[PDB]
Design a protein around this nucleic acid. Structure first.
Lengths: 400, 401, 400, 399
DNA sequence: TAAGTTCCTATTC
DNA sequence: TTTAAAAGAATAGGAACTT
DNA sequence: TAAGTTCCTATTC
DNA sequence: TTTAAAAGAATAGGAACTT
DNA sequence: TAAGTTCCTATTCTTTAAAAGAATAGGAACTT
DNA sequence: TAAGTTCCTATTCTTTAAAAGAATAGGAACTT
């Protein structure tokens, strides 16, 4: 894609190509400066600091949509997310003195506004009210989860896809993370970590998150119909490692858990199977549904205090400076969080305790037996995902 | 009304009509651009963002009053609530290049004047309004006593039952919720629900979305001890007024969601104010431009203050400090306003009054025999609109008493 | 005083007199424009809004100290608490076009700065620490109160003064109010109000307070050697009604409780008798001691919640719009406040209750007997202070 | 030092000396105006407001490094942290009309440069520091384990007892209070008090006023369970170091109040850092410009975060948030280690370990008639509250 | 010996 | 690190007279 | 009959 | 009445191809 | 007398805005 | 088939600046 290409082009070459466009003034040539113009405007306002894919993408669009120019008077303007327009205009000019630039703050023309209105005239909150309904009716969060999960069971056209959809969904719910949170997981960071309520849980790491604050992603045995480890198994056995896509203009992590485009097909599917009204609403949550469900679950269950941590929201109860530079360790999802989500335990608002449900299978005890042929079951991830892990999962699976 | 019409006219048509006015320059034609000019100036400064009724109304007036023009020199000016006049003038011109526009800031001191003015005062309605309000609560009567009085002032002056019902309902409604007329008026009748309350058993709760500051809030109704009972007036209301189709109140064309009904009629306020004005159960109500339908809101604000519960004011009155965000009122608020309990400043808890009648218990009895879908019989007008579960509760409560 | 005179002069006359000063340019004449110049600058920046005494006083001084002028070049300047100097200068000029004005913001040049420093180089916190000591030591608040109170008992040169000092002091303490709070009480507003702990208490009203937020002042029977009603009695029988002084270039209230100058005489006394170190410190609290003491009492007793109300400090729990426009009734001093300060009861931080002290005289019961002549004991306030009140006090007194 | 001298020189004298430099235009003379030029530029932009040591120091350097001039054209320029350069230049000139001044903003981008720079990177500070810090806590050891290690790294490397005492005291001190060096150093020794705390009986509390952000805060010392005990290091400290006369740190020269004593010596930090640097009990400490004395602060910030108690961070560490505030009771409960925090209930739980600090306080508070505190800590006798010196003295022997 | 200081300069919060 | 300055309205004090 | 309405304008929050 | 605007970095959607 | 007053001046508190937007209150001629 | 992909564009999150001040860390030449 354009961005990948930008990343492949040498700085001087970019600047080079940008100038050539203005030597033999052509509409064909000036009309495409967009991508380059983006890179330049950024590099200027940030002094060589690399630019991230998404950002380049957004801005490129913004410029491309607003770009306009007069070849005769050598004047070109466009919109950009900035407030020090002048400084930028000056810079651009030094590069092409013969021209006049005019950067317009992103943040109009009547006839446009009008037609736009005249258009609408002929045609978020809704989704929030719909989610409320979805929840505030017959079933529970878990019941809803299973339903959504099952809506893929028969509709999917391939096994990989069915596997991917269900894995992703459940994954996003369990961790209250975004698509990108699950997608950018470094497969080589899978570990078994202890948890006083479940014996052990699988933990991996995501670094390239939205707010650039690393967090862990977990997988663990759950009681009942829905079991993460199971979907994790099905996942591993149908999808293979993905080479970490480059997401910024610069110059280490060779793999990523899912494919960047999984989200489109996922959303598209979730949209069609529409296991609930909410999913019909255009621009309504899609992949993000997982996140909202767990946020609600925690609330409804009376544990909002965990939400921020589980979901990874910069915590404001601590001075920014105190976080930015005096804290050196990815905050921990508290032990009991998993206890609850695993369903082998319940929460007593009064006794402020986890009450192990009298199910016959004890999560801890069963771990012991397992701890007391992995590389064979998951050949694709063999050599990538820790063997210690591949074994645990392999066992756990057969062990059932 | 003009606004409704604006909402019915297609964008291009509006712009169209606005231009035609300047083709065959006529006083008749240019003098009416007002409404259109308003729409345009807004759309420009807000980039397609819809405009609310009230706002359009205010601005339309402002322009209309200030509009002036020279057909010969093709120059037209008017006032508008803006500070980037130039940008706007430019825009207007592109639409009609042949003309010159001049937007004058709505918002933008000579000694000798000031002096003479003072020299005038030295020798011999608003600051008066606030005095009477202080007075009102300053004299003997308690808030509740005042409320009952005002309430009764409609009892024998109203010309119809509907009106008597409406006035008393509205008044008590606004007091109980410390809400504005619009708060009660824009309630979505289809949102009535029974909600539990540890002090009164249950209370009726509805929802208002189209509020002034566009911050949704709930409106409540509940059993109260004594001669004034909300549920009773709610009953009388329901049995004399009917659902009202939600009026459109902004240029958009959103035909999605948007509640289909509203609790009261937009014009109720005029007749209400007018009545409250004439019956003038108190001096305050005589003062021109003094509070009228708003009185309810001042009373509760004062009640809360005087009682030492200002912490609730902001929430109750709804002022600024994936959930469809809305904040309700604390449980004990109703406990107090219902009068079945008393507030203890020292402990800060709500204390029930050893008066035999304990509200909670009476709710139980009512909740016990259901199946008596007799609610839908007493309130036929709201049948199908207001939750049956609610219509039953009220119906029972009423008969049960 | 100058201010009173200003209030007596007609607007046009003032402006008149101000101009005459500049017709026959005289140092004598221009040097006195001060008072007038103040009035004008205010009226301008506030558009006819009346000006309060204190404010006029402060500003008059500020101008007077900074006023300077050149009769030859017709240029005059002075300092004033403003930031829109120009607007003001323009206005002044229209009144006297022949002149040039220059308003200098109240709230530079090196050589000045330097000399200033060179000056300092050669030459509040204390009082706060001293108060801490005063408190954070042996004697209790009440013990301290009695001592201070007694320090006037013999030092005073007259009975009226001894009465005034002791009344004022105890008054300010009981109500945690300033001098002005006690002084500006409308004597015609005395009432008997019920209180479920003491039977009844005397309540009066102050409107002309600093923050212009009316509040009530109380008097009540107290257990022990210090009894408000007693000092209230002694007060009433030695001082007389005071004509409400005008305090704004304007409102109705024909009388005020104390004389405006009582404070000087009071401070001066409290200063000399210095019953405590604190009172020696220049500019340290004088009449204000009473407030501080109660503020501390409430805190120390664990009842800060009452402080704001009792002392009257703008509520911050309700939007200003709400406080301003909609709140129409003075928040009420909670019932138990008096219970505590009266000393017939104690406060239990745990049980959150007032515990009546087993004293033999029940405040409530004794009220009954009294409720089951006054115009003779308090002839001066006869016709001014409610008879119902004069009787209650009269009785209570004799009844002892 | 230069700063102390500035503080000793009379205003008019300074301005005097500054002008003389320009009368007989000399490279020798103009080249030294630096310190004076600093004082002037500040006094101007702040109108007589005194200037703090550190600030003067920083600015003096900035000017000194940037100062340049032409004796022939009588033109002199330098950098300064300002944005209203002109106003300042004008002022300076009035003082020396014959000259032309040009104040250059300390804080600021040519494309072609940027580009080439990028074109360069395309082919092939804290960063490393922040990696090790992550590492530190990432590896095995717990915060407390790390603390003890660092603490012990001084035990045998120190060349004197005073120094060994100082280092260990300071370190543990900074950690317990999550304060800066200056926070511990500027404590007014005469402000020590024994305050009650429903979880440990009592704790020692002192006061610091001259803090970085000029927001006073308290510094505490208390009994802790295990090998690491603050009271113990506090004891060792008191018995080897002595009161320090509060150094003047601002050209305010206001004669009154101002505590006369400071807890530690201003230069303790250099040696401390230098030591911590060499003993490098951990990789982190090797990184140049990486945290050193500060380490204690970072540890507690992390401790609180990791423990799920960030709500306490701002208070404990003294950062701006929305009668100087003071640490919640349970904070000490936790750091003392006699109690454990329960995330689910959110209460502090004492450990069934026999030694209940509260009870042991009682015993100590009981048997009086022991002014023997003033005997163990003679140096601080008369400075540190006796009530305190007794408590510590007892506690110590009592163990 | 250096670890300690002393007194600026360089870095960081 | 951090981030509300100041208008406007009291309460002290100075000092020359009064009782 | 005048209280109630209709639809702007004037005021206030 | 109200009073954090917006840069920067995700997650939906559109639509023409692939299987 | 020197405490008690006058009448300014010097210090020290308390509380804060402006204006685009969006309601509520009033004016008049109509409606029932 | 259309579900599943590509590769942009359109919407919707998430957190916060810039720089004057004010400490802490380091450089070098001295010192106990």
């Amino acid at each position: 894609s354009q961005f990948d290409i930008l990343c492949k082009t040498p700085p001087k070459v970019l600047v080079r190509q940008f100038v050539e466009r203005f030597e033999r003034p052509s509409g064909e040539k000036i009309a495409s400066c967009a991508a380059e113009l983006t890179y330049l405007c950024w590099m200027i306002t940030h002094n060589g600091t690399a630019i991230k894919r998404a950002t380049f993408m957004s801005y490129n669009t913004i410029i491309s949509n607003s770009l306009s120019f007069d070849i005769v008077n050598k004047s070109l303007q466009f919109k950009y997310k900035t407030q020090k327009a002048t400084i930028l205009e000056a810079s651009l000019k030094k590069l092409i003195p013969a021209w006049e630039f005019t950067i317009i703050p992103y943040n109009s023309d009547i006839t446009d506004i009008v037609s736009s209105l005249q258009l609408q005239f002929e045609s978020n909150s809704h989704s929030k009210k719909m989610l409320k309904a979805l929840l505030s009716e017959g079933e529970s969060i878990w019941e809803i989860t299973e339903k959504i999960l099952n809506s893929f069971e028969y509709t999917s056209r391939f096994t990989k896809t069915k596997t991917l959809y269900q894995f992703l969904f459940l994954a996003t719910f369990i961790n209250c993370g975004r698509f990108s949170d699950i997608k950018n997981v470094d497969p080589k960071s899978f570990k078994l970590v202890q948890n006083k309520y479940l014996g052990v849980i699988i933990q991996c790491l995501v670094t390239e998150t939205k707010t650039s604050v690393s967090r862990h992603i977990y997988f663990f045995s759950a009681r009942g119909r829905i079991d993460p480890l199971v979907y994790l198994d099905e996942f591993l056995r149908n999808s293979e490692p993905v080479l970490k896509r480059v997401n910024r203009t610069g110059n280490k992590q060779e793999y990523q858990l899912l494919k960047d485009n999984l989200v489109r097909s996922y959303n598209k599917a979730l949209k069609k199977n529409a296991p609930y009204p909410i999913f019909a609403i255009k621009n309504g949550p899609k992949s993000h549904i997982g996140r909202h469900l767990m946020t609600s679950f925690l609330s409804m269950k009376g544990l909002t205090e965990l939400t921020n941590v589980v979901g990874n929201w910069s915590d404001k109860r601590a001075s920014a400076v105190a976080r930015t530079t005096y804290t050196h360790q990815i905050t921990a999802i508290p032990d009991h969080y998993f206890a609850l989500v695993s369903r082998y335990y319940a929460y007593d608002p009064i006794s402020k305790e986890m009450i192990a449900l009298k199910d016959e299978t004890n999560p801890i005890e069963e771990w012991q037996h397992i701890e007391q042929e992995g590389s064979i079951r998951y050949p694709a991830w063999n050599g990538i995902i820790s063997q210690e892990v591949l074994d645990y999962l392999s066992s756990y699976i057969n062990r059932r």
